[PDB]
């Protein structure tokens, strides 16, 4: 027997690499930093071990979604002049949207440096902090200056495909019962992933991909209460947003070529912004979640859903973006039930204009007012739960870390490095 060298053997090792974007009005995650797309090959008898919790595509996608966010905010207005003293009065002076607003008057710079401009705007009470018609100031003014969300770029997520470079392959687990870890009997080599919409949300995985046959529970260590549980639905739960107000965006020229878009007036339906989830559909979806959740804790255990414990408004609420305006919904009527072995649910949502999105300090963003009435149709395709540390297990909604949102889309994918040079014995002998 003699050593014979084979070049091109189908052998791969696990690897971490830089996957390039691909996609098929400018966007935050635009197509100017991506590549046009064009595929899937079934690898029979191949049983690969996946790990959705130590996947580097999740860590890289988090970096890239952040990077495309900042890259889309540099070329537009920085609101340094908006740190002035505000003389704010109430809008209603008495349940409505107008009880959430302060009518703030301030001196603003003009396009001519030596001239001022007495202007006013309606600021949400969540954006103004009192100084001790009282005197207020914008909330993120002692920490940073808010680069205005540029009005011509949309926040709508477009699907992005992460494609492996040459010498690498993306393995896709086609198993329908694959939780997040261990062998996957059915594997495929895709050129690159399905369109992953970077939907940014907390406590609820809006839009995205459904499970195939049954609700899937995915935790790094189900016995550890410090680990989030990524529930994935099989049938989506439709959630409808609204801001009933007919907003009136107003433009203020704060400098040469720079405009500040302000809420000048609010008329129309002044009901508080809310989201509607069907009460029958949500009840049967939690029934499926509970059924798949007793498999890890016992048949006789009591599964109780409570509401978020505490913390920032971005972590205690179903924070999300819808129609360019950022909502923060309570979701305390969604998660309120105890499970023993036409109607709708209305979630009161607050709205903010000053956004510190990626759990960072020092880089805020001022989302300008959206003219008109905002309406919203989304699919709740998952959950992020945390368990409380007895025969009763309490599952509060979780979140905060944006990586668990994209870990729910990149759980089935894996990047490998092709090792095409292999040696093996054969009856050969070089002449």
């Amino acid at each position, epitope marked *: 027997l003699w050593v014979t060298v084979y070049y091109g053997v189908p052998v791969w090792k696990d690897a971490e690499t830089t996957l390039f974007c691909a996609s098929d009005k400018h966007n935050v995650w635009a197509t100017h930093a991506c590549v046009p797309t064009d595929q899937e090959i079934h690898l029979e008898n191949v049983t690969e071990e996946f790990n959705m919790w130590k996947n580097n595509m999740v860590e890289q996608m988090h970096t890239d979604i952040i990077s495309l966010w900042d890259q889309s905010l540099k070329p537009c207005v920085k609101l340094t002049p908006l740190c002035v003293t505000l003389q704010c009065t109430n809008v209603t002076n008495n349940d409505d949207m107008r009880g959430e607003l302060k009518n703030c008057s301030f001196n603003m710079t003009t396009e001519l440096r030596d001239k001022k401009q007495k202007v006013y705007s309606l600021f949400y009470r969540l954006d103004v902090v009192q100084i001790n018609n009282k005197e207020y100031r914008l909330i993120n003014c002692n920490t940073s200056a808010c680069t205005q969300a540029c009005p011509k770029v949309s926040f709508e997520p477009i699907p992005i495909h992460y494609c492996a470079p040459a010498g690498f392959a993306i393995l896709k687990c086609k198993d329908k019962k694959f939780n997040g870890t261990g062998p996957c009997p059915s594997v495929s080599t895709v050129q690159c992933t399905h369109g992953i919409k970077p939907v940014v949300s907390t406590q609820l995985l809006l839009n995205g991909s459904l499970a195939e046959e049954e609700v899937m529970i995915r935790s790094e260590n189900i016995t550890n209460n410090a680990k989030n549980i990524l529930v994935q639905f099989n049938t989506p739960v439709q959630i409808n947003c609204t801001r009933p107000n007919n907003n009136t965006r107003k433009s203020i020229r704060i400098g040469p070529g720079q405009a500040f878009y302000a809420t000048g007036d*609010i*008329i*129309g339906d*002044i*009901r508080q912004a809310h989201c509607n989830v069907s009460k029958a559909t949500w009840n049967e979806t939690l029934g499926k979640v509970v059924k798949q959740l007793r498999k890890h804790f016992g048949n006789n255990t009591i599964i109780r859903f409570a509401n978020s414990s505490g913390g920032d408004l971005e972590v205690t609420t179903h924070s999300f973006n819808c129609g360019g305006e950022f909502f923060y919904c309570n979701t305390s009527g969604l998660f309120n039930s105890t499970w023993i072995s036409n109607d709708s649910i209305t979630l009161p949502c607050r709205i903010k204009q000053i956004i510190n999105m990626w759990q960072r300090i020092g880089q805020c963003m001022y989302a300008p007012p959206i003219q008109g009435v905002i309406r919203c149709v989304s699919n709740i395709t998952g959950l992020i739960l945390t368990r409380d540390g007895s025969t009763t297990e309490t599952f509060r909604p979780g979140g905060g870390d944006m990586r668990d949102n994209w870990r729910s889309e990149l759980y089935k994918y894996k990047v490998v490095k092709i090792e095409p040079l292999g040696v093996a014995p054969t009856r050969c002998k070089r002449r």
Partner: antibody
Amino acid sequence: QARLQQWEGRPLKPAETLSLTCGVHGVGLGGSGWGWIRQPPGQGLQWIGEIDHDGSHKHNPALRSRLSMSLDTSRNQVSLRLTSVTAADTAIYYCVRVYREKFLIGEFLTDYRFMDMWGTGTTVIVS
Amino acid sequence: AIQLTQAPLTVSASIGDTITLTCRASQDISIWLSWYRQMPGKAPELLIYAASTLRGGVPSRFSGARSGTDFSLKIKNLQPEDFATYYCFQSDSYPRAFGQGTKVEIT
């Protein structure tokens, strides 16, 4: 002391341009809206058109394509430029301020426009 | 468009009476209907806006009512300055319209 003053434009020949101008004192053109109301002799009042707070020009359907209004922010003046004037257009023209007050119905907030402040009168006669 | 019908076109009463003026709309214009008084030879002036609110300076005798179709205006303690032509003006639909005018005189 807030008043809208408009001055007589004298009789004008038929099939010409009707140029009106209202002088706004006490208050300014901003924030409200400014419109024109006429009154043919021995008859009721008629709405011609208005510019609302937004800068948007509501016009009466009867006067088709012969209507055009403008606001002189620098001089605080409201202008009317009715064209092709016929003998039926013999009426006293008033300049009005459609003021917006918000009235709250049970759950709905509306901008209600109610012509707060009236001009004095410009008797326009064509012959 | 919306047509406002104001009747009776001529109501006569002496000094110190109570009169009710009617302005019927075509559609339902909610409560958006303002009332204007034109003294003979002068310019019209605002009396009531939103069919119930009194203009600043109008005496408390004047009063309106109704938020459907049959809008009404009531005058109490008639004085010679009240003998003018009243107009009802709707503000619901952008083709704005006026009433025909109720000429109130002395008997």
